[PDB]
Design a protein around this nucleic acid. Structure first.
Ligand SMILES: [Ca+2]
Ligand SMILES: [Ca+2]
Ligand SMILES: [Ca+2]
Ligand SMILES: [Ca+2]
Ligand SMILES: [Zn+2]
Ligand SMILES: [Zn+2]
Lengths: 535, 535
DNA sequence: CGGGTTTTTGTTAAGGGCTGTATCACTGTGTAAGACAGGCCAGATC
DNA sequence: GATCTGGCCTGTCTTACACAGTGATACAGCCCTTAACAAAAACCCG
DNA sequence: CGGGTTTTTGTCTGGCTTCACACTTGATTTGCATCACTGTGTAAGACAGGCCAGATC
DNA sequence: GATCTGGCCTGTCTTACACAGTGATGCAAATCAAGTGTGAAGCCAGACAAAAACCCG
């Protein structure tokens, strides 16, 4: 309930004074009871020991700069960052769901006196949250950004007998309160130097603890764990910045295959995900050495766009949220243009377009109760992509050809959305799952012909993604929308709320408190209570 | 505790689910007990019936605009305003403190079943609190102001037998929890037209209920109330504007007497109070009519600087908060002046001055660690009026005579301050009061002799108020601290809080809700619970 | 009113774990009108 | 054209406009053992 | 391993309490669901035409 | 002088960067208002007699 400290004291003391009894507990008896949910309280043993990692088990908050020498003689740094160690945070994530994993193995008809080598499957995400300042006193504010690195326990399993049996899955994967924060900093997502400085220790630990066994007593017997990390919450901009690729508006578009933007337009859907991470490392090495002595052009053509040392590891996937939003904006543009009726007469001035936009806005508002926006909301997208909107727009297009065109377009888009939309299309919507190939293919066919006036050259990349990489990702990784960033993006409001109402205003502790509160919020043994009214 | 209407529901359902038996009441049963405290719930009748005031007893939150016709053909008015009536607010303010007045009646050895002609003393106040907006869209350069008109009950007195008795007195008058709001609006405090248009009905009701009696049952049997209204919580700018004088830069300074600065600076302290409200009004009349057929330059002098129609009967008296802050900044500037020792070499330019300021601020931050601030706050003002800091600056400054000429002046100021800083100095410091004559005339003589290089012409206003009036205003009214605006001012913060934790986002309920919550907060039948742990 | 019951009352003392307020370090900014006073001056008038 | 101004331009000086709220830390009471000596309003038959 | 020796059991009839279980039909609290409303144009970066200033022939 | 070209300059298009939370109204479903006559249950009153952890063998 985002209460402060003094407020809680007021409520407690007055309840006690009135009703005689003592329902709520005092403060010190609350600190001494939260010290059991932050990291670095439990005992744990790595084996074999972790290279380059300390062995102590008393590591709570630690400084994000990781001991970066900051004097007037070196590269100036002026950021703030706080973080948990990876291993301690991970063991706390485990000891905050001991009860759930026990209930799981019980329901699955197993023995609780079992300490088989469970395998965890984690999801990692990192999205900037710029413009989180506010005016202090009475005046303006300064545009300072921020970045938060966080993960999510997603699927715990165990190989009993001969096959693996699933013991725990997340109910709502990309929810607002099951992405647990791990590090946060007041930096920018493009200040590559500072970003790498802060995220180098975390990636070092994440690589180190990938060939070991963690041991800790899990309610009685001691139990062992392996790990499998799958970084997916990265949006297109990040995944295109860190992993090594060039900027966003390149000629090489898809971060999974390697085809020129033009070449995507000729052949739409027959490609194959062909971009690992070690491949990016060796390609950057080729770019650096240049063993064949080619000019910059032929070189960049050979290495397929990569021109920087891949700094992090990231699996190739589709950020469902931004993908849907981009498709929606794409359809908005095609509606504007179709009001333009430019397929007959092209290349108008940059006033007819403004007129088309304004009349489209007024019309759709007065017919569907939709106020005009530019920064498109996901809600705005869901409200726009409705067959009713197509029917309301079709009056402003003269001919039946455009009628049937827009009709078929929206119909196929809504027959393809559920596949990459649901959280497990393997069972929840298998019909579109088995139709998706033919569906997307005919969609592409009528997109090339009926609209060649627009998609004859440049085709925006998200279309290529939605068209030629969704079936393979499905077959590879089960769900799609499960591994999305929306599980994190919603945390921005929590960040701002905490920073406003729970902090100490020192720019140094001022992140310890925010991170601690976020961790506490996102626990599970602490929500099993707030969900009590479900008897 | 500034909870919401849904967070409270969270707390309620979780407590009820955990401990079985409910400990917090539901929401509907909270609102049904909310109604019994908002104004407009009880019967009450006037004797004689108030002319121009309705007779109903079920008026809640009335639109402040007072049915102001706002059609494009008329004056464009766009502010928002909400209010109570005045009687329906006084009634509730009395009937919540029913128990606290009956207890006083008991303690003062009086037959409980008494229904004498009670008399209430009500202090009225008003002060603009601009810069309330927020750049929710992250776009700066958009200000907005607000105004709150509020009152306070301060003494309830009955005339038993031969004399009167203090059935009730206020513990801490100028605090933020015993000043009740009455109306509020979104308009610049100097937008004279809108201000009058909104505040006229209140003065109508106030002048109506000044020659009547309110009959109302008070704990069983009925009792009769009559009122007295003293308007005192007005800063300098308001009392200068609404009472109809020339602005603060005038040659005429004192809102209580009629003397020009170039005359009070010579006749130091022998004045009185001779500027009432009816005198002010008839003087505006003789201005407007101009019966003597005399030019403007001497007419202005004849009417002692009145040039507008005053529309609020307000009693004149020195404020406390702003007076102390003014004196503080005043002798801070005299410190900065004494750095340059300009008495020896005069007429320096405006760069030596900035250097003097920088030196003073740095020396003070090194010695007494007084932070640097542009807009002085009462905390700073108290921090700077110390013998320690004047001794530090005295050790910075070169010469010696300045040591006497500043330290003795400062200790005179400190010997003077409490008789007005206090809250009931009629008996708390009944010695400094009787010495105030000497204690102030010595200040006067020394400012006239060892500092006449500044105070030969222009003397600031507050240094005239403190000098000439307070030893008479004490005998006139009583306290000088209790009749101050510290209370309402402190309330300002609360506004913003409620505004973005309790509001329905309609710009027409965003003031209903704020007013209602502020009312509930500032009750007394509620704080009687939050003070349980004490008793 | 009172000596001795009638059921109690400090109290005051030797040290120790639990509670409940009082601090502690630490941050938010240079304005916006209005009145009066000289100084400069650029056309007014003899 | 000299000598005047009132018109304008600066050019200061006055009053307003935020420091109170956050988590952590630090002390002061405040119950807990016996224990005896004194102390104590309340009241009966004296 | 065992018999006999403890902390603690099955039931003996019976007399004095609380508690519920019915079925009675409306007068109420309590729990969710829903309602109207209220935030602004990018900001870096890749690529392509087209002038045109200035090199060449 | 004629002609190609590299550099500058716009101009276009790609990914990005904020809307859930506020009080209130309104149905809809459990809950109680006093009703009464019966279980029915329990409290065990020491006593008499057997069930499972422990000294003497
Ligand atoms: Ca992003
Ligand atoms: Ca984002
Ligand atoms: Ca003011
Ligand atoms: Ca104020
Ligand atoms: Zn691709
Ligand atoms: Zn005066």
């Amino acid at each position: 309930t985002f209460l402060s400290c003094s407020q809680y004291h007021k409520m407690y003391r007055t309840v006690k004074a009135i009703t005689g009894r003592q329902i709520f507990q005092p403060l010190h008896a609350l600190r001494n009871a939260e010290k059991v949910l932050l990291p670095g309280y439990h005992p744990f043993e790595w084996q074999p020991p972790l290279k380059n990692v300390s062995s102590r088990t008393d590591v709570g908050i630690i400084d994000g700069l990781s001991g970066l020498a900051s004097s007037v003689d070196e590269y100036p740094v002026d950021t703030i960052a706080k973080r948990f160690r990876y291993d301690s945070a991970l063991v706390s994530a485990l000891m905050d769901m001991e009860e759930d994993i026990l209930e799981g193995m019980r329901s699955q008809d197993l023995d609780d006196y079992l300490n088989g080598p469970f395998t965890v499957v984690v999801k990692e995400s990192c999205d900037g949250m710029g413009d989180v300042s506010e005016k202090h006193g009475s005046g303006p504010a300064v545009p300072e950004k921020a970045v938060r690195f966080s993960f999510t326990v997603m699927r715990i399993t165990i190989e009993h007998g001969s096959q693996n049996v699933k013991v725990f899955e997340e109910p709502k994967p990309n929810s607002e309160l099951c992405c647990k924060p791990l590090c946060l900093m007041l930096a920018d997502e493009s200040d590559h130097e500072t970003l790498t400085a802060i995220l180098s220790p975390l990636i070092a630990e994440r690589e180190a603890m990938k060939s070991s066994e963690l041991t800790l007593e899990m309610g009685g017997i001691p139990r062992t764990f392996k790990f499998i990390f799958r970084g997916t919450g990265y949006d297109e901009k990040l995944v295109r910045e860190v992993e090594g690729l060039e900027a966003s508006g390149s000629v090489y578009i898809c971060t999974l295959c390697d085809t020129t933007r033009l070449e995507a337009s000729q052949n739409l859907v027959f490609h194959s995900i062909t971009r690992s991470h070690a491949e990016n490392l060796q390609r950057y090495e080729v770019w650096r050495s240049n063993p064949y002595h080619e000019s910059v052009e032929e070189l960049r053509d050979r290495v397929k766009g990569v021109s920087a040392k891949p700094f992090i590891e990231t699996v190739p996937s589709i950020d469902a949220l931004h993908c849907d939003i981009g498709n929606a904006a794409e359809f908005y543009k095609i509606f504007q243009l179709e009001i333009g009726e430019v397929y007959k007469h092209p290349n108008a001035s940059k006033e007819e377009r403004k007129r088309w936009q304004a009349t489209l806005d007024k019309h759709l508002r007065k017919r569907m109760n939709l106020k005009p926006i530019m920064r498109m909301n996901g809600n705005f997208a869901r409200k726009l992509m409705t067959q009713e909107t197509v029917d309301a727009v079709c009056e402003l297009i003269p001919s039946e050809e455009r009628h049937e065109a827009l009709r078929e377009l929206m119909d196929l888009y809504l027959k393809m959305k559920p596949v990459w939309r649901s959280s497990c299309p393997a069972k929840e919507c298998p019909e579109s799952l088995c139709q998706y190939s033919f569906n997307s293919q005919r969609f592409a066919e009528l997109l090339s012909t009926k609209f060649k006036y627009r998609y004859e050259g440049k085709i925006t990349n998200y279309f290529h993604k939605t068209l030629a990489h969704v079936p393979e990702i499905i077959e590879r990784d089960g769900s799609i929308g499960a591994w999305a960033s929306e599980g994190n993006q919603s945390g921005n409001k929590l960040f701002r709320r905490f920073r406003k109402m729970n902090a100490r205003q020192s720019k140094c502790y001022e992140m310890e408190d925010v991170l601690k509160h976020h961790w506490l919020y996102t626990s599970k043994y602490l929500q099993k209570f707030m969900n009590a009214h479900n008897a």
